[PDB]
Symmetry: C3
C-alpha cells in the first residue's frame, strides 16, 4: 500500500461525511487560521481523528463553501522541522488530490529578505527554491505510481500564472497593492533561523523571502495535477546586514483569499 | 556485518558462476541498456536473484569486450526511488569486491551549458553532489579502514587519462563536435528543478544536471577504482532556465560505440 | 521521554559523582585531546559508561579556578548519528548547568591568507546539513527548554571572541590567529574542486564536518559559545606538527578560561 493508496483511503473515509466533494483547497499557515471561519455550512474534522494523517503535537480540516465554491481548508500544516519526512508532511496534499481538489491556495508566514518588503506585507509566490528537496529530503522521494503522476515531474511553473494575476489584482482591488509583492520563496529545513552568513547565501541565490514550508507541498500538488497559488505574510524583515499585528494580517489575508476564490469561480465546478 | 562484508558475500556468490573475474565495470544509465549487448560469451544474472542487491527489470551481465572481461549493470539505483545513498551505491562496493579496477558510468542528463544540444555527450570532468554535502552521503556510517580511507579525497574523482581516451575516442568516431567535457551536478530528484533552482545550479558552475552517478563515483573512488562517466544530454535548458525514440536509439548506438572504443584503448593498461 | 528528558537523566547520573557542577564546557576536536589534561582534581567518565551517550571520555575538573566538564572526542553526522543524536552531549552540558561552551576542531582553510597551523576563531557559520534535512533541532520542542524557532543571529558570543583574539595576541600568536566563517558539511568525503568553489562563493573561510550543529543546540539551550578551528591544512587557489598545535590550542583555551573567570 503506497502513499497514494493511503491517501485514497483517507479520502474515501472523509468522503463518507461529504455532500459535495471539495474542488478548491486551502492550507492555513502560521497564525492564518481565521481564514477557515470563512467556510459556510461547514463540517469540521480534527486531524487526530483522520486516518493516516501525520501525528500532530490542534489542527483540523474544514469542509464548506466560500463564494459558491466547495472547499476543504487545512487549519494548520506539517513541517519537516517537526520530524516528519518530506513525504509524510506532504501527505495532506495527496489527500487533497484524492478528494478531487483542482486548485490549492496556500499561505504561510515568512521572513522578508527583499529590501523593499516591510513587516505586514504580502508576497505572492512566483517561484521557489527548495533546499531540502535538492539534497536528501524531496517529498516525491520513493516509488512513483505512474498513473497518479510523472516519475520526473516538471517544476518549471509550480505557481499558476493566472492564479497569480488574480491574486495581485485582488490585492489592488482591496487597496493593498503597495504592500503586496510578487517574489521568490526560499524554503529551508528549520527550525533554527539562519545565521547572517547563511542569510547572505540565501540572498545570493535570489530569495525574496525565507520560510520552512510550502515548497514541498506545491511540488506534490503540482505533481498531482493541481494548480497552486501561495501567498506569504512577511511577518518580519531582515536588515541589509542579514540579521533580525497578527490580527490585522489575518483579516487582510482572509479578505484576499476570499476575493481570489471569487475570481476563481469562473475556472472550476459550481 | 558491514556493507563491505555483505558486498564481499554478494561477490563470492556471483563468482561461483564466473570463469574470469571482471576487471572493468559498466553502469548503464537511462535508455543506455543496449550497451550491454556488447558483451561476448555473456552470463546474465537478474538483480532480483542477487543476494543483498536492492530491489527496483535490472540485470548484471558478465562478458568480454575487445578482450576485456567486464561486468555490466543494466539499470542502476537512485536516491529518488527511496534508497539511501549507501544502499544505492551497494553495487559499486560489489564491483570492488569482484576485483573491478575501472568503472565506466553513463547517464541521461539535462544540459545547462549554452552550447550543449540534445543528443550531445558530456564527458564528466568533475561533479557537484548536493545530497552528499547535506545528509545523504554514500559513505556516511562506519568505515572499514582496510577497505578505504575514512576521509577519502575527491580531488580527482574522474581519471584524467580515462577522460583523454574518451575525448579521443569521440574524435575518432566523428563525434568531436557533439562531445563536451564538463561539470555534472547531482541532485536528489525526482522532481525537476524550478527555474529559480536552475539559476542557482548555473551559478554553481554546473554544465549538466542529473539524479545519479556522483554518489557512485564517490564510493568507487573510495574503493580504489578509477572512474569515467559520460552523460548523454537528453534535453537542454534554455537561457531563462526552463517520436522521442528517434533520438534514444541513435544515442544508444553512439554511446555503445564510444564505450567500446574506450574499452579498447584501456586494454593497453591493465 | 524527550531528548531533553534523557539529557536531564544523564546529567543527574553524572552529578552523583560531582562535588561542584561544571559551569564551563569544553569539546575537544580532532587531535586536540591534550586540552583535557589541563583539568585539575579530575574525575574521568568513559563515554561507554555514560547512559544515553552514543575511546571517548568526559572529564570533570577545574582550570584557573573554574569548574569545567571537557569532552575528549565528539560525535559527527558522518559516523551515522542523526544531528540530534550527535548533539545530545550539548543538551547534557546544559542539563549539567554549563553556561559557556568552548569548542575546538581541525578544519581545512579556504581563506587565501590562512596557513597550516593557524587558528581561526569562529565568528559565524554556514551549516549546510542543517538547512536541508539534518538540523539538530528537528523534532518536537520543549517550550520550557528553549524557543521553537531559535535565533541564530549571534551564535558566537562577541565577547568570548574578543577574549580569544586578545588571548592569542597575549600568547604571541596574533599573526597566526584569524577570525572567520566556518562552513559545516556532512562528510566524510572531502569536497570536489567544483564543490570547494561553491563553498568559496558562499563566503567560507574554513570547512569542517562538525561544530555548527553543536553550537546551534548550545545556543538554543541558552549557553554562550566560542569555537576555534585549527587550520590543519589549506586548499590552494584552484580549490584542491599536531603536537605543537595541541600545545598552542591548550594554552589559548586556558588563557581564555582565565579571562572568563574574571567576568561579570
Amino acid at each position: 500500500m503506497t502513499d497514494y493508496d493511503l491517501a485514497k483511503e483517507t479520502a474515501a473515509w472523509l468522503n463518507k461525511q461529504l455532500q459535495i466533494r471539495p474542488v478548491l483547497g486551502i492550507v492555513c499557515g502560521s497564525g492564518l487560521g481565521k481564514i477557515g471561519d470563512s467556510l459556510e455550512t461547514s463540517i469540521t474534522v480534527a486531524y487526530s481523528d483522520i486516518p493516516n494523517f501525520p501525528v500532530g503535537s490542534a489542527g483540523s480540516l474544514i469542509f464548506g463553501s466560500v463564494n459558491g465554491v466547495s472547499c476543504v481548508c487545512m487549519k494548520g500544516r506539517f513541517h519537516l522541522y517537526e520530524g516528519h519526512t518530506a513525504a509524510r508532511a506532504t501527505f495532506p496534499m495527496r489527500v487533497f488530490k484524492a478528494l478531487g481538489v483542482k486548485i490549492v491556495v496556500l499561505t504561510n508566514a515568512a521572513g522578508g529578505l527583499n529590501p523593499s518588503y516591510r513587516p505586514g506585507d504580502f508576497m505572492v509566490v512566483r517561484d521557489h527554491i527548495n533546499l531540502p528537496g535538492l539534497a536528501g529530503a524531496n517529498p516525491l522521494t520513493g516509488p512513483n505510481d505512474d498513473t497518479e503522476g510523472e516519475r520526473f515531474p516538471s517544476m518549471t511553473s509550480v505557481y499558476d500564472k493566472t492564479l497569480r494575476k488574480y491574486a495581485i489584482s485582488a490585492a489592488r482591488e482591496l487597496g493593498m497593492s503597495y504592500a503586496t509583492h510578487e517574489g521568490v520563496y526560499c524554503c529551508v529545513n528549520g527550525p533554527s533561523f539562519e545565521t547572517p552568513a547563511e542569510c547572505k547565501i540565501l540572498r545570493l541565490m535570489g530569495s525574496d523571502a525565507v520560510g520552512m514550508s510550502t515548497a514541498p507541498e506545491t511540488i506534490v500538488a503540482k505533481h498531482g495535477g493541481m494548480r497552486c497559488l501561495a501567498v506569504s505574510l512577511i511577518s518580519n524583515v531582515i536588515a541589509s546586514n542579514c540579521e533580525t499585528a497578527g490580527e490585522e494580517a489575518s483579516a487582510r489575508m482572509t479578505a484576499l483569499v476570499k476575493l481570489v476564490i471569487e475570481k476563481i469561480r469562473g475556472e472550476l465546478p459550481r
